[PDB]
Symmetry: C2
Subunit: 124 residues, 2 copies
């Protein structure tokens, strides 16, 4: 399990696709993609505990203060677009800190209300 | 991972929520829920390899004759509703036969077009 993908959707205009790649167990996770429809500026970007979208982003639960799921912020430009490119060694695509089957969420405000989310699935 | 859930959606009216529960990692998986918007009769019900819905159900790829993700059929009644209740000892919510982060699909034809799908996520 070295690749994953998430389709972000919400009740507003936020939309995006986020890819994850992890070539080696324990090794870093590359996280990259693009999100549009945001207000200009910083937005919280987190993996939440449950891949449960039966009630939208609300059923995703709490963060998977500092949590393993706190990826930090994405940045939207004046056009409302955030190009994402992160390396993170705290999340994983295997083992205990595995984020597969969990939910990725983009928040209304900056890290240090849930605008869009999707369940993180295994990719080819 | 002892519980999972999947929200099924497509381009047409097929929609529903499927729950999974596995008390013990060796034991069977209970699968239950409801899907509406189906033509009366049998429809193929399968877990496909990738939890990738960037291109709708198409990107979910192949079945995860007999494959591990081949759950059988669901039956829609005369109102187009399939009430699902099954116990499956082939799939799992952990291990090599894990379906978390893969895609559940309901099909136009019976197992003997992908009408809706969703990525299977960890549930509380
Ligand atoms: Zn946190
Ligand atoms: Zn098959």
């Amino acid at each position: 399990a070295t690749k994953a993908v998430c389709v972000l959707k919400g009740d507003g205009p936020v939309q995006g696709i986020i890819n994850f790649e992890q070539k080696e167990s324990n090794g870093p996770v590359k996280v990259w993609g693009s999100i549009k429809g945001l207000t200009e500026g910083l937005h919280g970007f987190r993996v939440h505990e449950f891949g449960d979208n039966t009630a939208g982003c609300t059923s995703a639960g709490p963060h998977f203060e500092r949590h393993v799921g706190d990826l930090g912020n994405v940045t939207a430009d004046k056009d409302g677009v955030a190009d994402v490119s992160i390396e993170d060694s705290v999340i994983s695509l295997s083992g205990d800190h595995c984020i597969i089957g969990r939910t990725l969420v983009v928040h209304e405000k900056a890290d240090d209300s849930r605008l869009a989310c999707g369940v993180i699935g295994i990719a080819q």
